[PDB]
């Protein structure tokens, strides 16, 4: 009921429009009962007395009734369809907007396919609480109220007998509805699981094909697919088990009121005709009572899916400090003060990391595999927060500078290159959308990107494939380098930016890159120690600790761990 209250809150901006829907459906309900009444009247007024002179008049009244009933149904459906889709749109919007606020850590640990299921499959599942579901509820509650007042108008004594069977109908609804939500929430979570497999397997199908894992992934899929078929059948059975079960309950009541009615007739209270009439009036009460009870079983499918939607909507999102400052006139004074960090929060990754970088200095970060180089960078980007220590940009703490201004001043060329399924121009325009075509073409020329871009079928307007894989790995890195330089950041980070770029091309760029890097603070992570030897400062990391620091020639004559790394190259 807690999730229902929250879900029904999405209807609050549509209150006035929902009142109209109720006003129209009540008129549709009073016309829906006036129609067989008029059919019954015409037989008794024009057919029985055989005076067909009145027939065209009654036919015209009955015709206007049908014309009004059909027009009201259309009016109800039309306004409700747009009303329901505005709610579904808001729920989808709220989901996507939430993910943009939610921390990076979530996306890495949770399967992407499951999130995709929650946005489409789960939000499309809350449609069975909207549209015609609201109309049938509104139509049910009016007819139920209409019949119950007509029952007591016939016989008060027998009305209590028909009302005494209601707690049994509510009880069996409560048993079935609880089981419906049980297997339907389970169906939706196994669906997200299956969606996670399909998504991950397609994105890396090459690796599955290369290692002949096609069969092993099929049997991996078959485990979740069989689980989905098993729980789906249970949820489907419980969804429609209530209507034939209620017809059995109605028959128990019909026999009960026949017994009670027969008893009252023998007590000289009513007649045999009254029993035959009350069974007719009970039918116009049982119909909405069974319909509303079945609707309660049907809304459990939306209620279970709503939980999965709300689960995403209540995740502790990335928030800025209440008194957070914006970095004005950036210079590039990067500093780390006894910084400690761990991802699992058990085994430490970074241990007492303390160093200072003055503005404009081209600093090199070097060390072994899994030293903590990328970790230092992700902490400077504030993707994760320090366990104990301080990161100071331009003399202000990272937690005190707003995430907007920090990421505006700092640019990054990530270890794993991520591109988009659009034109080369748009991929380079990302970060700085207010960059002229001349600026883009000049930057691409500087990083030796322009050469292969011109060779493409449409040039800069060539729409790239998913993650821009229609290019060589090195060519993808060159585009990422261009995109970062176009963003024009005062602090630039080049984490393994030329892993797949050949030493010949790397030498050609380094010369032109220096001109468009002077007056900018930079952190260069590289295992090609020979390229970063010209740096103003070389930070040597090992097992999450700064073992050595200083210039190349100073560290070489020291015959330390930097020397051990440099000599290992040949």
């Amino acid at each position, epitope marked *: 009921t807690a999730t229902l209250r929250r879900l029904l809150g999405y209807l609050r901006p549509h209150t006035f429009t929902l009142i109209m829907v109720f006003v129209f459906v009540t008129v549709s309900s009073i016309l829906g009962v006036l129609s067989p009444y008029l059919i019954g009247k015409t037989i008794d007024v024009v057919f029985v007395p055989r005076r067909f002179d009145l027939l065209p008049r009654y036919m015209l009244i009955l015709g206007t009734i049908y014309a009004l009933t059909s027009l009201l149904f259309w009016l109800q459906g039309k306004i409700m369809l747009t009303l329901s889709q505005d709610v579904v749109f808001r729920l989808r919007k709220e989901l996507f907007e939430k993910l943009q606020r939610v921390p990076v850590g979530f996306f890495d640990r949770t399967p992407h396919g499951d999130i995709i299921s929650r946005v489409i499959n789960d939000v499309d599942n809350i449609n069975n609480v909207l549209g015609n579901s609201i109309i049938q509820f509104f139509s049910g509650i009016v007819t139920l109220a209409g019949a119950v007042i007509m029952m007591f108008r016939v016989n008060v004594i027998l009305s209590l007998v028909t009302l005494s069977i209601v707690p049994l109908t509510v009880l069996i609804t409560q048993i079935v509805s609880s089981q419906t939500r049980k297997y339907f929430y389970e169906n939706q979570r196994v669906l997200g699981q299956l969606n996670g497999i399909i998504e991950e397997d397609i994105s890396g199908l090459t690796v599955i094909k290369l290692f002949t894992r096609e069969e092993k992934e099929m049997e991996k899929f078959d485990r979740v697919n069989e689980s989905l078929r098993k729980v789906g059948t249970k949820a489907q059975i419980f969804s429609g088990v209530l209507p034939p079960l209620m017809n059995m309950v109605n028959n128990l009541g019909f026999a009960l009121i026949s017994g009670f009615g027969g*008893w009252l*007739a*023998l*007590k*000289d209270i*009513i*007649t*045999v*005709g009254t029993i035959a009439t009350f069974i007719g009036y009970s039918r116009q009460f049982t119909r909405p009572l069974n319909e509303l009870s079945n609707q309660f079983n049907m809304i459990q499918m939306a209620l279970a899916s709503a939980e999965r939607i709300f689960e995403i909507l209540d995740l502790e999102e990335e928030k800025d400090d209440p008194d957070a400052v914006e970095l004005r006139e950036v210079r590039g004074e990067i500093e780390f003060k006894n910084v400690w960090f761990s991802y699992d929060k058990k085994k430490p990754v970074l241990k007492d990391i303390t160093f200072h970088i003055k503005p404009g200095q081209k600093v090199a970060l070097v060390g072994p595999t899994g030293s903590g180089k990328t970790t230092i960078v992700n902490l400077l980007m504030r993707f994760y927060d320090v366990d104990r220590g301080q990161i100071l940009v331009d003399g202000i703490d990272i937690r005190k500078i707003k995430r907007s201004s920090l990421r505006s001043s700092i640019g990054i060329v990530l270890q794993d290159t991520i591109l988009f399924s659009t034109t080369v121009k748009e991929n380079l325009k990302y970060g700085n959308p207010g960059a002229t075509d001349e600026e883009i073409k000049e930057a691409a020329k500087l990083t030796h990107s322009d050469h292969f871009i011109k060779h493409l079928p449409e040039g800069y307007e060539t729409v790239l494939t998913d993650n821009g894989e229609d290019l060589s790995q090195g060519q993808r890195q060159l585009l990422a380098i261009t995109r970062a330089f176009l963003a024009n950041p005062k602090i630039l980070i080049l984490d393994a930016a030329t892993s797949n770029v050949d030493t010949k091309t790397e030498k050609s760029i380094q010369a032109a890159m220096w001109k468009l890097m002077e007056g900018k603070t930079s952190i260069i992570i590289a295992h090609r120690l020979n390229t970063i030897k010209n740096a103003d400062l070389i930070i040597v990391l090992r097992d999450g600790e700064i073992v050595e620091m200083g210039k190349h020639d100073e560290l070489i004559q020291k015959r330390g761990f930097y020397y051990e790394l440099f000599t290992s190259q040949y």
Partner: nanobody
Amino acid sequence: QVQLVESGGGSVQAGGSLRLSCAASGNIHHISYLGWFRQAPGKEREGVAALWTKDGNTYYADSVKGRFTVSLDNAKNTGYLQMNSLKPEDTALYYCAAADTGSDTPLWDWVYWYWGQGTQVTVS
């Protein structure tokens, strides 16, 4: 203390007519139901004719229809059933049943019910 006496049952040939009397004696307040039922040598209970004194509507068996007519005398306190154009198929033991409603009956607890003696009606 109410008792019902049954009289007027004899051998009548096919197509004939015979009237059946059902005299009721006791502290009768108001009769709400009057019924007649036939029982064959090896059968439990059936339904031939019924009278509801509140409206006067008479409900007869499917085979009877326009043959038997059930009536009740208020002053004489005697129930009647007129049998006309009798066919040999309805050769059975005929019984009487009456429902009485007394002054101030409890909210849920019902009043009384009374049965007849039984007289054989033979038709060939």
